[PDB]
Structure formats: structure tokens, C-alpha cells
């Protein structure tokens, strides 16, 4: 079975499975970003903690999508998870730029799935995305952009000093 | 009067009154289901309690629709409430199947009213349904379907034993 | 850099990165197992919860390995994560058998890495595995085996009844 | 007497006495490092506190070794304690480099004694080192290396500013 599926198209079902893969990929990326900043030759603990908390948030997003797939009577299908795009992530600036690229891509996939649900006249899907993902993405993207601007201002002629100071005074708990 | 009605079509107003009748009918159905399982010759108290709690939930749904009708300046119109479809409800399996049919029908009426509000460019209606009814229906329908599967697994060659066990180990508080 | 690496061979470093991939694969497998038992046509919530808690435990194992890689001055390297071996997991019995196969394979990789560390005269690695992984694996494998025996005893001529009963009376919180 | 000595070689006994001398030497070194940073012409209180806490940790290590020597029935033998290698310790960077050299040397002596105990088939010794010294050393060495990287990043063209800032924002309680 399902004995429950109603108004839930095969197109939406497959798009949700692809979205789950995207979120789990993003979680993996953030795991790699976090452990890079924990290297003794990088050693930016606030930066590590920022990214490790994003890995957890993206995992949680995936899990919420999978719960919804089952609540609608669709079938979760998992694919391989590709490794992150880089093995070494550069400076905090490079990392924050990569993070914003990633979140914009997740946001665009959410918007695409919202448009498909609106084409499929699936209001439960659209509300689901609206309520648990779209505003979260916009808030996160704003925070990233705020961080980017602050990092950029700190580079100066004194890039090491600025990278330290950002980690100490903005990020670090 | 109304001195408040704005962007609220006569089509939506009438559809809301029909939806209220549907919810109150569903409440009535659940009242009958509950008292059937309280018969001394049926005597499945967890089953009775499951359905009596659904009768209350459907009443509450109707009441929320009626409050919204008034908040928009529409006029509540009540119709006769038809008796439930059966006087005797069979086994827990039969009852759970009937309950899922009923909830699918309520869900389809919600979806239909959402489509009408989207055709009428009525976003307050659409949000209302989204926020208080659509996810509730999908959650409930999932729970029912989970129960159905468990009841079906228990029938075995031992149907009385399975019906007892489900009531004792899944339902009963 | 590293300015800290001491007595930490390239062979151990690479084996730790492979072990991280194994644990993250096992976490993924358990995520899939969990959501399968949450399907409305499977609907064994204790079974779902057992596997979702194992997905978290395996993630945590991976994270502990990655922390240790950095504490030793090695470099975390991530690879693609292959999808689980099955899309549908059968009965609780099938799933529990698959889980024991998986844990035996993780255990064997731990034993292999312990032997390499003992060949490389790396006592910190050996203690690390001993203290955080080996006994955890043996405890878990014992619990699985206990569950397997109980499921097997319950199959009887009444397999649905037994699967229900195990989930209700052993697993379900 | 001893009336208790069992499986405890004269080679291990002497190596433990040498290790005690190493730890007490390291404690002395850290005492000197601490009081240097308390000079009014150096005046880095977080730096002083970091090193004074390490002097206590190394004393405690020595004391744990001496307790174990007695628990095994060996005889503690003390030798003269050589003065630290420098009277003046330079900048925080110089000091942190000296500290990592020292800890690497303690770690190597631990590893050497572990290898001797494994050659002597002395598992209580090996467990002792494993449980109370090896991971402590690896954790400490990681922390030092993290500090070194942060100090190095702060030197910039502005070495005084960076030394202040590190002491204020990383070390100082
Ligand atoms: Ir929408
Ligand atoms: Ir949702
Ligand atoms: Ir935090
Ligand atoms: Ir935190
Ligand atoms: Ir809508
Ligand atoms: Ir409302
Ligand atoms: Ir219970
Ligand atoms: Ir209740
Ligand atoms: Ir109750
Ligand atoms: Ir009870
Ligand atoms: Ir070992
Ligand atoms: Ir460890
Ligand atoms: Ir639990
Ligand atoms: Ir739980
Ligand atoms: Ir050993
Ligand atoms: Ir000991
Ligand atoms: Ir702080
Ligand atoms: Ir302190
Ligand atoms: Ir203190
Ligand atoms: Ir302060």
C-alpha cells in the first residue's frame, strides 16, 4: 500500500526525494566545513561551530521532508550522496561565500518544488514548504549575508587579524 | 448588515456553510461509531474512545468554520444533518475503513474549497484552511492508515484475538 | 600544517577516513530502515524508532572518528556515500538480520583498524577504539541477537501477530 | 619488602622513575614560563595563567606515576631536577613553540614506556598510560597547536597588537 495517498502526484513525490538528497548533501558539506575549521592549522572554533550547527539543521530538514513524504503516502527513495565540492575550504570568507551559494541552491529547489505543487494544485505541499522551509532559508541567507559583509570589512590589509576578530567577536559562543 | 465583508464571495460563503454541514455530519458519524463500540456485545473501550475523540474534533472543526464565516461577514446557514450511514459498524477493521473513507471525503471538500478560494483570489480563506485543517487531515489520515495496517496484520486466523490485542495495545489509554 | 602530528601513520589516517565513510553509510542505512517502518503500509513505530536511534548513534561514531583524526593531526577526507542496499526492508525479521550483518561489518572494520594500529605501535588509536567503539559494538550486537531470537520465536504460524507483539512489547517506548 | 610485586620488571620500574623526573622537569619549566609572563615588562596575565595551570597538571602527572610505582611494588627514586632551558621566554609565540616541543617530548617518553611495557607483557602499565596520560597529551598538544595557529595569524605587521588580542580574547579568563 498506500491506503492514504490523496492529491499527491508522482511528480511531487519524486521532487521531494530529490530535495531530501539535496538537504542531505548540504548536511554533508557542512560536516566537512566544520571539521576543516577544527584542523589545528586552521583553528577557528566559532567557524567550526557555525558549520556543525548548519549540518544538523540540514539533516533535520531532510528528516522533516521524509516524514512528510510518508504522511502523504509517497515512498522515500534514497540515492547516493555525493561528496562535498572541496576537501579544503580556504578562509572564513571563502567558506561563507560557499555556504551562501549552497543555501541559494537549496532555496531555489524549494521555490521550484513550491511552483510544482502550485501547478499540481497541492496546497498541503505548498503550506508545508512555506511553514517549515522558506522563511528558514530567508532568515539563514540574511544571517550569512550579514556575516559576509562583516568578514569583508575586516580583511583590510590585516587579513589574519580580521579573521581572528570575526571568529572571536561575532561567532564564538 | 455586514459592515465588514471584503473580498468574500457568495460562492465561498455557501461552500463554507456546506463544509460546516459535512463536519457536523462527520461528528455525528463518530458519535454513532463511539457508542457502537460501547455496546456490551461489542465492548472495545479503546475503539469507543478513539471515535468519541474524533466526534469532538469534527465538532470543533465545524465551530472554527462558523467563527470564520462570521469574521468574514458571511452568514451561517444550517441544514438538516443526515443520520450516519450505518446503525451497526461491524468489526474495528470495518469501522477504521469507514473512518478513512469519511476523512478522505472531508479532505477532498477542503481541497475543493481551497481551489475555489484560490479561483476567487481569497488568500485569507486559503491560509485559514491551510493553517487549521489541511495538515490536521493529513496527520489524521496517516494515523488511520497506520491503524488499518496494524489491524489487518492481526486478523491472522485468530480475528477475535487480534481485535482484542489491537484495542488493548494500540488504542486503549 | 599540522604542527602536532606524532606517531600517526598515513596508513592509519587513511583507514580512519574509510571508517568514517563506513559509519556514515551505516547511518544512512538506518535512516532508510527507520522511514520504511514509518510507511503507512508497514506502520511499526517501535521498529522505526529503534532504527532512527541507530542512525543517530552511527552519525555520532563518525563524528567522534573525525574529531580524533583532527586531534592527531590527520586530515579528514570525505568520499561519496553510497545509498543503502535496499529500498524496501521486508519484515522486522529481515531488517534485524540486515542490521546484524551491518554491525558485524562495522565491527570487523574496527578490529582491522585496531590490528593496524597495533602493527603501527599506535597505542592512542588502540585505546581510542577500545574505549569508544569496541564495547559499544559488542553490546549492540548482543541486543540485536536477543531481538532476533525473540522475533524468530514469534513467527509461529501467526507471523503478523508476532510482528505486532514484538513491536508492542519489546520495542515500543 | 615488597610483598606485592608481580609482573613488574626492573626495566619498567626504572623507566617510570625517569618519566617522573621528566614530568617534574616539565612542571618546573611551566612554573618559569608562568612567572615570566607575570613580569611587569611582559604582563600577559592569560599567558601566565595558561602556564601555571600546566605546571600543576605536570606535577599531578608525576604524582600519579609515583602512586602507580608504589601500587606495583616498585621503588620511587628521585634525581636532581634540572633547571629549565631558558631564563627568559620571549614572546607568547616563542613560549607556545617551546611548550609544544616539551609536550612532544613527554609524549614520546610515554610512547616509549608503552612499548617497553608491551615488550615486557605488562598490560596494567599499558592500560595505566592509556587511561591517564596518552589522551591527555593528545588533547593538550591539539590545544597548543590551535593556539599556535591563532598566534601566528595575529602577528601580521602588528605583533604587539596581536599578542595583546590573543591574550585577551583566547586565554584570559
Ligand atoms: Ir503556493
Ligand atoms: Ir508539514
Ligand atoms: Ir551555540
Ligand atoms: Ir553550542
Ligand atoms: Ir492557496
Ligand atoms: Ir482562520
Ligand atoms: Ir504502551
Ligand atoms: Ir485519551
Ligand atoms: Ir481519554
Ligand atoms: Ir493498561
Ligand atoms: Ir591493542
Ligand atoms: Ir579518543
Ligand atoms: Ir526511546
Ligand atoms: Ir524515544
Ligand atoms: Ir599496549
Ligand atoms: Ir593507573
Ligand atoms: Ir569569550
Ligand atoms: Ir582558569
Ligand atoms: Ir583560573
Ligand atoms: Ir574580560
Curated annotation (Swiss-Prot), chains A, B, C, D:
CDD domains referenced in this protein's UniProt entry, alphabetically: Ferritin
Main location as per UniProt: cytoplasm
Assigned protein family: Belongs to the ferritin family.
Additional record remark: In horse spleen the light chain is the major chain.
Places the protein is found: Cytoplasmic vesicle, Autophagosome; Cytoplasm; Autolysosome
Positions where N-acetylserine occurs in the chain: 1
Keyword Acetylation: yes
Annotated protein name in UniProt: Ferritin light chain
PROSITE patterns: FERRITIN_1, FERRITIN_2, FERRITIN_LIKE
GO biological process: intracellular iron ion homeostasis; iron ion transport
Residues annotated as binding Fe cation: 53, 56-57, 60, 63
Gene3D superfamilies from the UniProt entry: 1.20.1260.10
Gene: FTL
Subunit-level organization: Oligomer of 24 subunits. There are two types of subunits: L (light) chain and H (heavy) chain. The major chain can be light or heavy, depending on the species and tissue type. The functional molecule forms a roughly spherical shell with a diameter of 12 nm and contains a central cavity into which the insoluble mineral iron core is deposited. Interacts with NCOA4.
Keywords: Acetylation, Cytoplasm, Cytoplasmic vesicle, Iron, Iron storage, Lysosome, Metal-binding
GO MF assignments: ferric iron binding; ferrous iron binding; iron ion binding
Gene Ontology cellular component annotations, sorted alphabetically: autolysosome; autophagosome; cytoplasm; cytoplasmic vesicle; ferritin complex
Limits of the Ferritin-like diiron domain: 6-155
Region (Catalytic site for iron oxidation) residue spans: 53-60
Species whose genome carries this gene: Equus caballus
Its biological purpose: Stores iron in a soluble, non-toxic, readily available form. Important for iron homeostasis. Iron is taken up in the ferrous form and deposited as ferric hydroxides after oxidation. Also plays a role in delivery of iron to cells. Mediates iron uptake in capsule cells of the developing kidney. Delivery to lysosomes by the cargo receptor NCOA4 for autophagic degradation and release or iron.
